[PDB]
Design a protein around this ligand. Structure first.
Ligand SMILES: [Ca+2]
Ligand SMILES: [Ca+2]
Ligand SMILES: [Ca+2]
Ligand SMILES: [Ca+2]
Ligand SMILES: [Ca+2]
Ligand SMILES: [Ca+2]
Lengths: 167, 86, 168, 166, 168, 167, 166, 86, 88, 88, 87, 87
């Protein structure tokens, strides 16, 4: 059916990436920086999702919010109007979820209509450029699909090094 | 949880949605607003306005967390204060 | 010809003179540094000498001694004209917008300069926000509204149609 | 003789720049943004250095870490695989040290292996884009080598200015 | 599963599979090289193996032996996956648009691939033209028309209003 | 008064630059590449000009052509729609004219309503990236206004070298 | 002993690349586009070279031409003044030679001052973006140094492929 | 030089402007089209269509160069051929 | 519609060098030159395609051309096939 | 509304170093600290502005502050002015 | 100020164990280091720890300098056992 | 295949004269060179010519290799006089 979720849905390198996280974490601002880097904004703040298959989910923006971004201080901006067609997209299947947790010293999955969508959690902490990390998260996700898993390859190389160091 | 009957002749638009989230935001707890099955985060204004709540609407404000109640009270206080509903 | 010195950074963003204000330590210079890299013009850093040009215009500039310079905590003084070339500076510019950087805290503005109401917006400095990007868009959006595209006014109009509608 | 140091070594504008600072400051993330801007990653987290000249230090990454970056949340990424050859480099002589100290209320050098390396300390504070500042730090360093010292020139101009007979 | 090999370069531009055709020597590879640098994906260079996926879809790919490669007159063979990384390649893509490069001379097209009418546009190769930029915009404009923004149709409509008007 | 001229008027680094040249030289395509690099399109093909002062001229696009570019092969494109507000501008005073001449082996000024506008002529020849040269022409023009004239400085340095070489 | 050569010397990705070719081919314009893309201009038109090692050649610009570019139509431009320090460099060892031959119906080297410099010849033909090809030529050259030779790898794969028993 | 009375009921729009410049383009000479004081290059279509020439309009086609005449003849031939005017 | 068939004797097959000479010869004509091998056919004027076929010793290839040079191109291609001892 | 005036004795004037210590002291207070010299006045917590004034020997400067630290800030500024032998 | 251990866990100190070791250390203000065959690394950064490739039978030395200096080592040693890594 | 000249023009071979010299040379297929104090440059590229800083009394050598080899030198010599530059 159709449920609405809180977050920002952007098309990054062809992958639908849903950015979640407590209000105030700066989801919209990060999304703004992503469209400038050449990505597509699907929906800001309210993402209306519905299950297409038993393996895929689709998100979109309620018509009233289409093309809009609310940025604390500036107000509402229309990215279609400020950046053109290359900045928006009617909808997209959701491939990855990156949840922005607020950092404090003290695989993964999330279900959306009984379909487990992969998720990663990045910490919001001074000095971090969130747009860049999310962009790479998508980039890396895509690479793993193409068969290049840096982690799995490293762990393989590490075990050979350990097994070897046993002299 | 606590429900309301919207009375504002203009519905919950620009200004009203503004004071509502402004009040909800003041609480460490989580707060939601529902209208005809749809549920948004009451702490984010885009979502609230996207619902397009009109006069005569029946909305349900819910919260979760320690703040739970204080959150509700202030939201009720604001619904009334702002003459939005009851 | 009466002049006054203001604290902030004056940059030419998309043709618009944008004066960035805010408590020392907020990082005005660093943000300005990132703006020239993105292709904008630095007019004056730290001390902006302004003078009223008429009933509706304020012009700013840098005292000769500071011309082309930026002081960045840790690095020291840098000459952007020397590191980025002519495309990074400008002798002066009329001030169109004021973007004040207030440091964020849990718990149609206008500012007066010489008896001239310059518009102003306040953006919160908070972890994760890329200040240069927001200011750049603030200018960009300001310009769009001048061209007749006001996203806010258009949305509020669309919201009333929606409400009126859901009212059955 | 190799000595291991904690930091990230990147080739910025031809200059070997060693980024140091407490774990958690975001050395890797900043390095990630630097390769995207077109710089070269030499070594992340563990930088194996060895003295060479009386004034030269060389760093590199242990083979096991070559091309890798560990980014909190994402895990390990291979920048050679995500950005290509233009993002890496086998090694580089270390010219500058940029220490990222968490913000809290002139000439300076740190000696790696008994050889003075110029160092600068930039504060990590909300709103600062670290990759941009480090990049300019290298850029400015290079300019001073070419004979353009903005500081020295300003102090000279300040002195001439201060000569206010009036 | 029937396949045929076509001569051209298949690139993923803004999500759209764009097959670049044209006489050998026109510089298909060089243009494709500039497109991956601008952020697009190379699917297949020189030999594009296509197969009809259904009544309205054509899929293309590169024979394994050519995967990731580009042959550039003078330089030789280059591996864009190795020079630009994963973001520069893609295993395959449905072909949406065909941009044929004809060499310019003084004195709603569609092309058939496996009994499927793929749209096509022809751009002239002529001194001073930046081919990568035009193809990129061709894809960009194609996409916009899909989203409902047809500049041509809108202009022709506006021209008739104008004419009708000047007719007094 | 108001006369219309053949060319493309773009706002490059704040300077109104009118690009002239025989039809077929690729004025529109070059203009297309300039908006992508971040410049503003004022008018394509037909530039309606009128004299403002005795020292300045202003150009604009007839409403019917506003925001449009006609590119051989593609047809008509709306840059406001493909690139957003940052790609257009209602009008601009014309500061520089760069005439694209077709290259063949075998200061300057041009009058527009009795005001002499500075002009430069660049040759269209294989391998030349016209957008880049025009962009630098504007860039250099601006620098000379700021007081940095590379030519005048060089000629000064050259004469000292010649006078010196006389031993 | 200095010898003057006709061409443009640019620092592309750390590699000294000497661009040669008949006057009129557009060496300067291409060089102009290369500094905008972030490369360093060493010398335009006249490149003064001098041998150093048994395998090293160094080039530079006569002081009078330092930082300058002459572009047909525009005149003389100072790239240091239009783009800043990041656009120039006092000198550089010459690693590659890219000769721009006007188009007309493998390993190769030209010896400057009695020392073999690798050379490649690219055709100037309508539609080709010369700055992009030269930039990749340097980029590819560098990759082969790092051990990634696309050609050698392909010929190997072609040979294994050609081994068609079938 | 040569003048015409536009007769096309649709005026000189999309298609017509197309064949007109197509014909003019074939000549090394320069060719202009005027309508109510405004003059555009007849070799560039945007300009021609921008004039919005309607039925009953009085346009003037002029050319300069060796081709001068041949240019005019073919343009007249096309005005007639295309049933645009006379 | 001019065509010709061959059988490669190249013990080394049609690798780089032999592919090169083949296309350099096919390239001197305006005629459109094609090379088919094992069902797939490529444009004989572009080397990547030719080498991609991976033609080995004992392969049976078919060279075809269309236009003015048609016959003249095939004659030249048949001589290179001979000259370079590539087959049949 | 706390204020204080001085006369610089600094034969070297208020160049870099002396400017630095002045702002480093002004920076330890929340109070807003201002420095006026010859009509123009800058924010004493930002060094570029202070040095831009080019205060020379014999100059008459006025340091002012507003808020809680108000008086406490001026006291500290007056001691640095003394401690560093900058003037009056 | 330090503490030595001999690794007993069969599969050496790889990915998982390492994140639990560095996880722990990270919790302390003091900066702690790991020593293996003369080469030292920051025990608060995982890449370095895994780069050492500590195998079964290895003799590592954990050191800490800082206020919580001691709390650090105890915490780590506890992880050393609690996580079946060594002794 | 060459031709020598001694510069007589007072203000040496600067900007203007140089563009007229290279202007000329450029018209020939043959590639021509200018020699001053052992250093040689392409007479078809102006930067190089002016870089030599040829002054009054200088002895330059113009050479050309190519089909129009001779037409080149004559044309240049003519400019040498026609332009009051030397002999
Ligand atoms: Ca928001
Ligand atoms: Ca500052
Ligand atoms: Ca890290
Ligand atoms: Ca090719
Ligand atoms: Ca056009
Ligand atoms: Ca040149």
């Amino acid at each position: 059916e159709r449920r609405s979720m809180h977050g920002v849905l952007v098309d990054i390198y062809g992958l639908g990436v849903l950015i979640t996280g407590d209000s105030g974490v700066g989801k919209s601002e990060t999304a703004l920086e992503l469209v400038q880097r050449g990505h597509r904004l699907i929906a800001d703040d309210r993402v209306d999702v519905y299950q297409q298959d038993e393996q895929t989910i689709v998100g979109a923006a309620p018509p009233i919010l289409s093309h809009l971004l609310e940025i604390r201080g500036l107000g509402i901006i229309d990215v279609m109007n400020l950046f053109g067609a290359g900045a928006v997209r009617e909808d997209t299947t959701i491939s990855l979820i990156v949840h922005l947790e607020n950092w404090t010293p003290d695989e993964q999955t999330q279900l959306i209509f009984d379909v487990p969508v992969p998720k990663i959690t990045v910490p919001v902490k001074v000095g971090r450029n969130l747009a860049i990390i999310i962009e790479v998260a998508a980039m890396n996700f895509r690479a793993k699909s193409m068969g290049y898993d840096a982690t799995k390859t490293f762990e393989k190389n590490l075990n050979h090094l350990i097994e070897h160091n046993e002299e | 949880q606590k429900t309301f009957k919207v009375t504002a002749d203009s519905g919950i638009h620009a200004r009203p949605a503004t004071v509502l989230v402004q009040t909800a935001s003041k609480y460490d707890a989580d707060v939601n607003l529902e209208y005809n099955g749809k549920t948004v985060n009451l702490k984010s204004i885009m979502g609230v306005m996207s619902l397009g709540i009109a006069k005569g609407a029946e909305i349900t404000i819910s919260a979760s967390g320690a703040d739970e109640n204080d959150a509700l009270n202030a939201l009720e206080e604001t619904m009334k204060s702002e003459r939005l509903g009851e």
